[PDB]
Amino acid sequence: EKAKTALASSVRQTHQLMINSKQLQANIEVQKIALAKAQSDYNRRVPLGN
């Protein structure tokens, strides 16, 4: 029974890492959006300078 409980705990823990992956993917999405905003802003400003 002790061994079975240990296996259950390990299987549960491995799932916590498989979800942290999705969390970090969402963070990447946020960063992509910010970069897109900056790029759009600069492309808007470039012609004026010329």
């Binding site: 492309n43 808007r44 400003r45 012609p47 004026l48």
Partner: protein, 50 residues
């Protein structure tokens, strides 16, 4: 009368400079609108000043 003629000359020079400044501002405002950084109220206000 002589002094008045001289004053008129100076005023003409001042007004020409003002016209050039207003034209530059209008061009800036129009370019900003073309790239999408400004509304059309700004364009109309610049036109009025010119």
């Amino acid at each position: 009368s002589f002094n008045n003629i001289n004053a008129s000359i100076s005023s003409i020079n001042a007004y020409k400079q003002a016209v050039v400044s207003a034209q530059s501002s209008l061009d800036a405002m129009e370019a900003g609108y073309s790239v999408g950084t400004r509304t059309i109220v700004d364009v109309l206000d610049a036109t009025t000043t010119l």
